[PDB]
Subunit: 462 residues, 4 copies
């Protein structure tokens, strides 16, 4: 069931159905931290596939036999395509350079390329893990490159598409609610009117601005460290390798990757990941507000605010009509809190580089990808299972507009401030409406009230 | 105007009306970071006065002349009593060991004692700042001792008394509201009843637990670094000085200070400050919940929840009866947010010690004292200006109870499930009460509803 | 391959090899957030097994048929024993009360108990998920109970045992290094001596204190919410149920669980989880310092500090003798940063309760358990793969003690301060040792130096 | 002594020498939280002066009498110029909309203008605080406008200039050290060479990227809330006032302020402050790395790394040549830790808006201004008192290069791998240099070593 390989510490059994080798087995023994939920994120593994395929193709310019390079490229493609995910058992909590995962990737690509070429597994023949798959590379500049490839692809494919769907659904709900006037709330106290459409347009702007902030963090993510080798000098690498690898990754991905102009900055720090996390942290603040507002605006049916009817996600009860838990609001605000915590973990790691190498890399990229996926996935779920189904409770909104004390200020140009306050004071004391009170005191008629108090004239400057 | 003092780098102008000297002027030239709001917290300065008073009294056992010791003690007392606060211009953002503030204290006490002895300011005759005021002490073990003295005093005099007042005021309201039944809220949806007294009793328990948590953090704060000297060994101090100065501090303050049993832990780390900040961080979460709940329970007057009437302390508008902004809730929840951020500042500093000395000391104690003072002061203000005057809106509460759809389950034993549901569903569609609808459907009589639906019976297990 | 079940939204296929039902299937469709690394932690699932077994046994006092109760107890035991982990596919990012996981647990326990009794899967006969497995319970008080059971077991079995091993290994290394004198470092500058044993005793004290802080957070974790039902009143539950369930959980676990004295505080907030996270946050600060110190003390072989020889964890190179990457230091400091971020996520959730129910529960317990397991697992790994193998580089330590300028202060009682400084100044200028310089200037003999400069006399007070 | 003013709650003693009035005295009575270090930041007060000056000039278009407008403008100018700072006693911990400070500003400007018009202080004649100084404005849109004005000015005048000085000083050192070769460090282990110039160029790039990140956060800060009034609709302000007052602020400041295109987003949230704090958070991570590296590179003189000689700004001990504490590194890394905590405070506040108004405004702007000022001031101090005077310890660097085992790979083409390894292994065991050992083993000549081992050739790709 197993073959036998060796490292400098002793003999190791490797399962015959596995493409990794002795270094990866030793690593599962030396880094038993946290269990399977801690495995290196698949976007990192796939990004390594993209990177090893670009390096193999470029290394033909520097003496790599095309037959060996072609097998490496095909094997790297299978990694990048997600066909070999089961051959990566290592956790985030390894060396802070990600060396063990670089070797896991070199081992798997070598053994699969060996198999494609007819050799025997575990043999290093004819594709040596370090000499061929890791040719012209270091763990020090490859893991950072994989981080930025994975981050950019996840932003492009998961995070922004999720936010875009949320933006568009909130914008639709904003135009659908454009004529529904409700009582505003400041300090949670009753305030002057605005439309539900206006209130929702604020959410739309926040999501639009979140997308812009995330996009503004991407140019530094597109800088790749490949070619910095061990300490950033590019020692033991060939001239032009850095530019060529980056240009190859860009063509493979369709994204504007470039080589980092300063490889010392690219190896000794991950400030671009701190900044991207910062943009997700702002996004989480925006989404906390939007989701918590929608939560409260749907509270009720009778002892809450009751402006919105949220779609049911849980089984409703026949005995409990109108009760709807805001389920997606809760998942989303829990996600928002997680992103804020992830951002502090990214910050602590990003602040703790030493000399030529920051060695917090796996934890930093784990937290960035975790926030990116949570935000994108929750944005989709919140859209499809809550926002698109939101309805306005117009009867309750209309009833509360008539019962509000806030519109009393439309009477001042007609009967004077002092008589307006007496109406408001009296209605507040008696629990009556402004209209009932304004008439019961003989200050005006019902026809005068209905003509002077028009909330649709209280929604803008004059 | 000025006098002239000298250090080994040249001449310095010292204001004649100031008790500090050359080293302190030099320190103000080198650390112009942030302005006057960044001055070293007065509790640290006073704690330094206590410590120097204790050292001078104890140092009589080790050769210090009693007439010199007496003037040092009297000057140090003035520092500890807050009488010389204007003679400390240095900011938090100085050396990470606090050496500049230690020198500031030595100079101020030296010069004030020289003045009491009839000497000339700046003269070092006959009270030398380092050889007599800093006798048996080091740069490195004095500031951490002052940190723990200041934190213990602030916890004892400001933080716990403020929380005690808040606990007692919430408990009185809990008892005052013990019979007022309202509709519960889970997920912000209407839920089964509880009293305002029960809900407030949750707040009371939270504040009680906060006080226990803070008290649980004090035993390690009572351990003092004095006697560790430069690196923790006690080199260049006298045997027994560590224990004697801790006991003298205990007798001067009435708090159970002892010498730290491991001086390397006490100099190389400030884990006790991190743990005390963490207890305040939990307190902040509790206060955030309490204040935000009271904020929303007082929302209205007509488009909110309207269960509580909060005291109006700042005049409002005559045209706006019933509109009262929950301004003390806002001060308190802002303070809570600040404590959470301060806690992360404390954490980063506490995580970053190097070898024998943590050199983030001034910023860690600044954030701990800041949090303690804000929490204590806001608790007093929130108590006196909001909690003690809260009234229940019993009329609105009673009406909302009658309009709730939640109570409809008390009718299950009497008319079966299927009829109650039809009442709930029909009331929900018509906007009428459960009682109106059960009568209009002829499923029971008014007197039957009033005898079957008793919220008083829905407040406990059976 | 599948059976057919229904909920109020439509027909659902349930795999026949799965013990969950339609509610769980619907939940995997409604909460597609984050993928499989986001699954509810297994310690929560097992804790639910303990809880449903205690409730079933107690519910016999309240009309539960013993035959049905016995099948429920056996099925709950299989959940608690980890035999049914594959039947829980739901993610953390569900409703904030954990309702979906409560139903997942009720469904799986019902179907497995049905199978034990001979019935057909998916039928609810004879063990109804809600009426029997959820009898006398609410999602609102069960998920909090499972959180605290899981937290206490993880602290007892993973976190503290890991820290204890680390404490004991550091204490052994401290006694083994008790006679090795080295140069201290303050501000990272050379300082007076202390032994490696003394420096390591500081680490030992930090870990001892971390264990005490964690233990001080457990009494509030041992308070269980079971019996609070929907809003904390205990409505729809039987008198004595809360005390009996808690006493049963305590007997099943061997841990001192008790019923929460105030169920409103237990449902509306999770301040005990915030406080336990706070204790882990302090622990992370302590471990960051210890691991980073050991990292730097092992730096070299020639351009670093070079006091410690760390055991190899990576394949060493023949060309690179003495180069050893501090692999476990990096995994541990990365873990420490993660705990600090997790703590902020716990804090944000803990601060955001609303009225009767905090609905951030799954994210809060996820982060607490994640920090607890990471800290315990990394503590074991750091112990076995680094601490127990640490050796002192005594030749380099001894060589640097002889080259240090720091010991020049042992000459002052013999040749006076002024002549001591001239030796230090001259050796610093020439790059020579104090001994060479003190002799070359004719201030003393080699025999006088060797007798007056004894670092073993510079390790304590006099 | 005092004069007497009145609000609707009674009589208030106002100091005769103060320009504030009844509302401000009332505010000091109700918000005694934290003491004088908690006063509203002077940049907010000055920004309010700019805003009130702009509003008064624009309000001439809307009826304001030019002679009244002129005195308001002149008084508001004195506020903006920092001439009336003593007339603002209110703390940050006030209403979450900043209303008290808005009233403080209105009263101070009203009374100073009344004084210029020859009236009596407290009289409201002829400059009414709310009817003329607050004309066309609201409580709710003035404070957020002042926040953004203050943040933009502080970024432009303090933060970016400080970072610019640090960037330029690091770049000059980079060029000064361009030819000094030293041993690299990865994982803190010895690594292949790089120049001090290359390493410092990484720092330069980090500071350059920090400045770009901060600049990228300013476009949303330039959007002003003025004109949103109470809830965002602009009710009770004039058409065109929003655009005109933003343009007047732009012309007064020379910064590209514009009116916010969505006033609901601008009042309900402060996402732009969260994003600006996040850019400063990234800056803090960069500065932490730079300062901590320089801290350790200057460690010694003999038991550290010893590559850099840092300026000695505070006198040391004559008995301790070469011992220089990196005190500016400590101030800077403490500041970095503080910015990270401030950022979490900003995040919590920014996440907690409610409906039409975020009421965490004073604490959010306080933390943003605090971070900006600390970063700017510390950058200037770190530059002038450390960076500009750093010297390389070329003699020690050259010796460490010669004693390194890293260079041994240049001998591979000339004597093969196996002989070089035996040299490295033997030098490592004997404590001798690579050159001494290769000669003593007779594998090459001294002149052969000097020609084969050229570190100048190991600094780049080939």
């Amino acid at each position: 069931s197993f073959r036998i390989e060796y490292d400098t510490f002793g003999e190791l059994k490797v399962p015959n159905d596995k493409y990794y080798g002795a270094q990866t087995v030793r690593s599962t023994m030396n880094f038993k931290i946290g269990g399977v939920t801690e495995r290196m994120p698949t976007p990192v593994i796939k990004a390594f596939g993209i990177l090893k395929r670009a390096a193999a193709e470029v290394n033909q310019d520097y003496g790599l036999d095309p037959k060996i390079a072609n097998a490496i490229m095909k094997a790297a493609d299978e990694v990048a395509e997600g066909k070999l995910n089961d051959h990566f058992p290592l956790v985030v909590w390894q060396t802070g350079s990600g060396t063990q995962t670089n070797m896991n990737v070199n081992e798997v690509i070598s053994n699969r390329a060996i198999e494609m070429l007819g050799g025997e597994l575990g043999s290093k023949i004819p594709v040596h893990p370090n000499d061929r798959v890791n040719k012209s590379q270091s763990s020090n500049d490859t893991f950072p490159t994989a981080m930025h490839i994975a981050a950019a692809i996840e932003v492009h494919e998961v995070l922004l598409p999720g936010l875009q769907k949320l933006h568009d659904a909130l914008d639709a709900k904003s135009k659908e609610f454009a004529q529904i006037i409700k009582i505003g709330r400041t300090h949670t106290q009753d305030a002057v009117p605005l439309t539900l459409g206006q209130e929702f347009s604020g959410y739309v702007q926040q999501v639009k601005y979140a997308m812009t902030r995330i996009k503004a963090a991407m140019p530094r993510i597109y800088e790749l460290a490949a070619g910095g080798t061990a300490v950033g000098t590019g020692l033991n690498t060939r001239i032009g390798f850095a530019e060529k690898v980056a240009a190859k990754v860009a063509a493979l991905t369709g994204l504007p990757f470039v080589t980092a102009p300063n490889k010392f900055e690219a190896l000794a720090a991950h400030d671009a990941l701190v900044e991207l996390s910062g943009a997700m942290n702002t996004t989480a603040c925006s989404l906390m507000k939007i989701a918590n507002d929608i939560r409260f605006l749907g509270s009720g049916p009778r002892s809450g605010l009751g402006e919105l009817i949220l779609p049911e996600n849980e089984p409703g009860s026949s005995i409990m009509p109108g009760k709807v838990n805001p389920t997606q609001c809760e998942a989303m605000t829990m996600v928002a809190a997680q992103v804020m915590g992830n951002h502090v973990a990214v910050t602590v790691g990003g602040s703790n580089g030493h000399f030529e190498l920051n060695v917090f890399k796996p934890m930093m990229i784990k937290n960035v990808l975790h926030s990116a996926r949570l935000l994108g996935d929750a944005s989709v779920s919140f859209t499809e299972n809550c926002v698109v189904g939101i309805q306005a409770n117009t009867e309750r909104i209309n009833k509360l507009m008539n019962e509000s004390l806030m519109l009393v200020t439309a009477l001042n140009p007609h009967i004077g401030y002092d008589k307006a306050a007496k109406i408001a004071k009296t209605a507040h004391k008696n629990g009556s409406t402004l209209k009932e009170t304004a008439i019961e005191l003989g200050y005006l008629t019902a026809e005068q009230f209905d003509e002077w108090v028009k909330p649709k004239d209280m929604l803008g400057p004059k």
